Design a protein around this ligand. Structure first.
Ligand code: SF4
Ligand code: SF4
Ligand code: SF4
Ligand code: SF4
Ligand code: FCO
Ligand code: FCO
Ligand code: F3S
Ligand code: F3S
Ligand code: MG
Ligand code: MG
Ligand code: NI
Ligand code: NI
Lengths: 268, 551, 551, 267
């Protein structure tokens, strides 16, 4: 039985988005690549290298024209004709545009590809932009986070495979099952926020009682995500706030990598 | 005579190009090139020192944790902060568990397919494969039934005609030397490794808040609130959960990874005599356990000209000898300022001009230690530990040597460690030793909480005038890492990362001296220049991370 | 003649006393006594019908889910509610997954130590033990290395001198027939069973909200909100997670539990010739898949005088022949009203007067079906499925028989199933068949959601006057369960549970006829009347649950 | 040597023992082989009858002053104890005997902690709590029906590792597990605050994960860790996250007294 083909291209990535897959449990990475999809190109895992792996990619783009899901992690640098990320002697922006032409679906995994992320922050030395900016004529599904819970991606792919279309998306083309609500509008520390029960410094009495982290700079009030419900790693109880640290807003453009850790969020 | 390019190098982190001149079937000269840059050093400039770690952690997700920890250490250095001992225990568990994940994935997911032929595994007899491991390993998942199930997964993948990431690999290449049975064993262990690495990351997640990219650090300690009697914080139940995962790592590491390492050497003994990258080695001490950022569980030092007897120990992250030695040059890199720069005075001004054999050819800078090229990473760290007379390291290395002896009738001497396989062996030794670090630090934390110490964080102050310089050292999976922060008027005025893959992958330096990747390739035989598997074997041994190297 | 008492019977749920008269080393007469009562039928009276399921689920935590599901079915019966098909799929997945956990725990944790001698496992050769399984199982954890690790765990426990729950066992008893090697294999599988049952309950938890004691039901359907696109509800990610646990159950069930059942029969073939409890058997159909509380995946029926060819099929939970046949007596039970009572007219008026051989001796009632004693549970369910010509059941039984024939040269005929080992075989067959139920119902749910059906609940109305009656049937792990609810003026005016262990464990009835436990013991050889292991072997085959039996 | 534990079941449904089979830190096999010595437990004991009662007697003597006594189920006092008889004696007598030599005494589950379901309504058997039958003793209460098994296991670990019980509230419940109202640490509190309520199972609000207050959620009056620790260690599993209101099973006067749909009082 044939498995749906996937082409994964890394641009200005830290590899954290690929590494999220090694934490996944439903499916595990081994079940993903052996049972769920055919991973036709991925530079981190491929046996082949160099000319052989570039031959793999050209052959798969041809063979699976119109059928593959294209996934990109990392931002795409446009400054100086694309030379801040060169693969096989060509700018990554060109590899991505060529692969996008025959894609059945296109996914920006991670904040960097979804909206520029950390790579585009501050003075943006390389003119890093999002995948949607590189592909104005295409619908790009955005799966932000740095990195997202891998199941935000895997259940998006599963919806495409099982039901034949993408999951429902919000106005930023983010799947609603994962990004449909502010973290602060589904956070278990909301009772403490409501009562004015706040941690003031790490290790203080309030912090050691699991109180709200708003005055530590929690960006939950301005960040869409599922971090408080789905959480991370499938062990139970694991997300940054539960561990004791404010949300930094890594999912959300203009929050993560722009605002200081301790800078207060705006509350609706 | 001919010139080849390997671009992309796969089964590494990031974007790497390798060029080689081949003469008379052997590499005569090599070039390593990092082909992607982000400017992370510039992105973090002008921010609050407390914020840096969350940004620069994103230098790399393979070696997640490392840049976070080095950054907070740099701020703490500049500010003269003593980290609470509970925060050290937590930081240490995270780094040790992370590194366990990292080394396992390197050996199996990144490196094994250089040495293992999966097609050949189809010809294997599973019963003979299992029989080969009797008296060699006590691992519980080496039965003929396990191997038959694994062989059938391979058969099914091949039967589908969609090989995906296993396609067009180096199957039947003359440098592939493992018997069918051993190839099958390796694939079974590749899959089993995935379970072990997931357990290691569960340890990391429970303290870090997630992984990749932990979120429990602070300049001043950690954000974990210790309270055995508290709901929703780091209580005894949560600690027991952490311990349950720490306990699951040792058997695979000791009975599979350690054994496979000795077996690869037994089948590929010529790889003990090639891939030497350098004659100088550097590591920093790691896992501080006192209240003043010291008393490290693992030792550090500098070895010059491979001489272990006259090495210089490094016992402090404030060691001025270590600090003053480090410079970087961009003569053969795509930056403007070329003369060697101490990182507190470092610049990172991009100056791309395309590839040139004799000019600039990489986004990686060229680091030196008192003007010398140095290899960092697990080979360095093992050699330093041997030089220090560390019994744990001697004994662990001796276990690998004994397996090798049993299989071949030959021994392994220290001279044979300066090699592709020696580097791999160092990494395995490190992974094995880290399991005792995890047990030691978990126990230390439990004991200390029991004395009534729940302190995790000391709030810093940052003078609004003055210029303060700090450096944070860390022994990362790939070797010595350092972050260098200058604070002026309350904000970061300079930030420079010198990363272990920078040391090893950096291009020719200000004196045109060759760095470890480039040096290691000289003399590599290449049977088929179109499919230069031998080159990739040596390069993979260094565990390249080019997001790290370039940042 | 000698009289013995076994009190407490251990490795059951709840509080059971068994007494036997022994004549020349053979049991001639027995008595079963449930020694604890709570009055759960009285506790739930005078409440809202919607609330009953949360209270009566607490009848039993071993067979958690079952009383909850029977209670909602009883209210839905009274109210004439058609349950949404998605709610049926979810209920079905929970019951199947629960029953998988329950049966595995029964075979290993509760029963194995009747047939396995742990001290004899210390004499085993782990390599010979592993060799005995070659070509008998494809399970991946039967290596000599696995067995050696387990043997060492036993050795370390014994060496501690603290045997705890393994102390004063029946080690060296003449009825223990396994060789050392097979005892070691069984201990290894006992420990491995614990992982499999944990995975089964992960399925239950993801749909139930926890286990023990699920919390996702309602009169009218389920509380799970189906929305593939919703955050915090039953979405595709959650369904994928459930699927990941479903997929982990089959290998252990098929390659370990199924195989061990055949092997126990092979070594204990005399136990195919004793422990017959009844000549009549009853089971209800289970796993409805339509929109009208029917179209069951598993069939039900009534077998009279062991004649499968003339059995009476039951295809509906509203079957009047089934409903009208059921009565319970308290002639030899500690309740006041003694004449057989239909459960809608039942009373539970306590009348304790102490133990009497010829009078009242148990808190368990005596159920009959048209005046006859009947055995329920997996033996009944298997025989009914064979009478129905269900190919799945025939084929699964045949797989067990094939393993038995490989080991012994003999086959099994249906007559041999009316026995202690037949009952164990029936349970194993059930657990095997349930894995396909799980796959089928998961697939059905995903498909139905894909058609656009997200409905899970139909809100009931309960008339505030009038009197009306409902009954909820369920094929529980231990057999046919029924909850009988009378509603009067909107509240519960009568509530009676008739539970499978009530059928099997009930005392002599209104006509002084002997129930299955008591009947099964007649003829049991007892080598040592001080240590009546043979008695416990037969009683455990029924999987007694006395919190269930008595409530 | 491992620390000894004696477990006695009274009017139990066995769910509190079964909770151990879901535990992961420790798993039940590591509990009994590595963490403790389980000297008596009728559900798992190899021995039966006279042999197991001999085991208990020997353990009560050998480990006098050292063992943790655990009891699940309520204790029925009506009619001189006869609603739970083991080996021909009322369970209250077996419990009181075992309590005499105990180093620590734990009531696991709502039934032993406060009477629970067995003591509800008309209370047919005069079921009472463990504390009621042991007035001279400090009983550590670990309520829930059943509790998450780690509420029990981390209490035992605290005794073993640090030599005393965990910190307790005024109902002798460990504060790490029962120190806060569920509603004071519930992730649906923003919905509560906004007036975003499910009205019926399967409705639009329910299918968006809104607050379950108007379905009868007892979170506002129930102490516990169900919203944080949750259940089964898979992540995201507790009754409210699955879509059903809290019933108050931890809390005397709430669970088994109030109707599922009856509204809680909010402080
Ligand atoms: S989104 Fe984050 S984790 Fe993913 S590539 Fe960007 S920096 Fe790395
Ligand atoms: S500010 Fe942060 S911790 Fe506080 S309730 Fe909002 S999201 Fe939760
Ligand atoms: S507390 Fe609940 S689970 Fe435990 S014995 Fe009582 S009814 Fe059973
Ligand atoms: S009423 Fe229940 S669901 Fe709503 S916020 Fe309170 S505890 Fe959570
Ligand atoms: N290990 C690692 Fe990454 C590199 N090189 C860092 O630091
Ligand atoms: N299975 C089960 Fe429990 C009993 N007997 C019920 O119903
Ligand atoms: S920092 Fe990121 S991972 Fe979630 S908690 Fe905040 S959006
Ligand atoms: S019913 Fe019980 S299990 Fe927790 S969610 Fe409520 S206290
Ligand atoms: Mg740098
Ligand atoms: Mg009844
Ligand atoms: Ni890296
Ligand atoms: Ni039961």
């Amino acid at each position: 039985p044939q498995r749906p083909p996937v082409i994964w291209i890394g641009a200005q990535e830290c590899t954290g988005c690929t590494e999220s897959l090694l934490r996944a449990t439903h499916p595990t990475v081994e079940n993903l690549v052996l049972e769920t999809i055919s991973l036709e190109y991925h530079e981190v895992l491929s046996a082949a290298f160099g000319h052989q792996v570039e031959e793999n990619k050209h052959n798969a783009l041809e063979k699976y024209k119109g059928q593959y899901v294209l996934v990109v992690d990392g931002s795409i640098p446009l400054k100086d004709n694309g030379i801040y990320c060169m693969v096989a002697g060509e700018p990554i922006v060109d590899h991505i545009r060529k692969a996008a032409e025959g894609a059945a679906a296109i996914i920006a995994i991670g904040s960097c590809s979804a909206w520029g992320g950390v790579a585009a922050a501050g003075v943006n030395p390389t003119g890093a932009v999002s995948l949607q900016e590189v592909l104005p004529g295409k619908t790009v599904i955005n799966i932000p986070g740095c990195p997202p819970n891998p199941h935000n991606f895997l259940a998006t792919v599963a919806h495409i495979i099982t039901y034949g279309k993408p999951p429902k998306l919000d106005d930023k083309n983010r799947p609603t099952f994962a990004y449909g609500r502010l973290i602060h509008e589904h956070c278990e520390r909301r009772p403490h926020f409501d009562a004015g029960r706040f941690a003031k410094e790490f290790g203080d009495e309030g912090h050691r009682e699991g109180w709200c982290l708003y005055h530590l700079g929690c960006k939950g009030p301005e960040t869409y995500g599922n971090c408080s419900t789905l959480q991370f790693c499938d062990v139970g109880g694991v997300w940054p706030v539960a561990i004791g640290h404010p949300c930094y807003g890594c999912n959300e453009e203009g929050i993560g990598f722009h605002k200081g850790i301790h800078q207060l969020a705006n509350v609706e | 005579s001919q010139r080849i390019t390997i671009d992309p190098v796969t089964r590494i982190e990031g974007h790497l190009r390798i060029d080689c001149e081949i003469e008379n079937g052997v590499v005569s000269k090599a070039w390593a090139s990092g082909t992607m840059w982000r400017g992370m050093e510039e992105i973090v400039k002008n921010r609050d020192p407390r914020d840096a770690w969350m940004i620069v952690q994103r230098i790399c997700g393979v070696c997640t944790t490392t840049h976070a920890l080095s950054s907070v250490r740099a701020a703490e250095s500049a500010l003269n902060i003593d980290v609470p001992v509970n925060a050290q225990y937590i930081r240490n568990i995270i780094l040790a568990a992370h590194t366990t994940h990292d080394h396992i994935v390197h050996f199996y997911q990144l490196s094994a397919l250089d040495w293992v032929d999966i097609t050949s595994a189809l010809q294997a007899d599973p019963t003979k494969a299992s029989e080969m491991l009797k008296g060699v390993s006590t691992w519980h998942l080496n039965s003929p039934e396990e191997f038959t199930k694994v062989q059938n997964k391979i058969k099914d993948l091949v039967a589908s005609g969609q090989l995906g990431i296993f396609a067009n690999g180096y199957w039947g290449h003359p440098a592939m030397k493992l018997p069918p049975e051993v190839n099958l064993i390796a694939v079974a262990h590749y899959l089993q490794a995935l379970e072990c690495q997931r357990d290691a990351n569960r340890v990391v997640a429970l303290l870090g808040g997630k992984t990749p990219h932990i979120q429990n650090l602070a300049v001043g300690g950690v954000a974990n609130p210790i309270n055995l009697d508290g709901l929703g914080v780091l209580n005894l139940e949560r600690l027991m959960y952490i311990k349950s995962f720490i306990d699951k790592l040792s058997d695979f590491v000791e009975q599979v990874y350690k054994v496979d390492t000795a077996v690869i050497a037994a089948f590929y003994p010529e790889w003990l005599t090639r891939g030497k990258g350098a004659v100088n080695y550097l590591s920093v001490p790691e896992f501080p356990t006192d209240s003043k950022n010291g008393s490290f569980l693992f030792p550090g030092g500098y070895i010059e000209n491979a001489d272990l007897s006259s090495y210089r120990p490094i016992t402090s992250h404030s060691d001025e000898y270590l600090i003053k030695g480090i410079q970087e040059s961009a003569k053969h890199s795509w930056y403007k300022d070329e003369a060697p720069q101490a990182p507190w005075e470092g610049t990172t001004i991009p100056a791309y001009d395309g590839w040139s054999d004799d000019g600039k050819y990489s986004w990686v800078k060229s680091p030196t230690f008192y003007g010398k090229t140095v290899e960092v990473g697990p080979l360095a760290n093992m050699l330093v530990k041997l030089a220090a007379g560390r019994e744990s390291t001697q004994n662990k290395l001796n276990e690998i040597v004994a397996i090798y002896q049993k299989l071949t009738g030959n021994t392994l001497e220290v001279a044979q460690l300066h090699s592709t396989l020696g580097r791999i062996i160092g990494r395995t030794v490190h992974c094995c030793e880290l399991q005792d670090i995890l047990q030691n630090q978990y126990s230390a934390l439990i004991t200390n909480i029991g004395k009534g110490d729940h302190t995790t964080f000391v709030k810093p102050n940052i003078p609004a005038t003055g210029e303060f310089k700090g450096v944070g050292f860390l022994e990362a999976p790939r070797g010595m890492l350092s972050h260098w922060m200058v604070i002026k008027d309350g904000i970061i005025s300079n930030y420079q990362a010198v990363v272990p893959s920078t040391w090893n992958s950096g291009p020719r330096n200000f004196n045109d001296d060759v760095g470890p990747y480039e040096q290691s390739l000289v003399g590599t035989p290449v049977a088929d220049p179109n499919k230069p598997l031998e080159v990739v074997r040596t390069i993979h041994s260094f565990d390249p991370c080019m997001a790290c190297a370039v940042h």
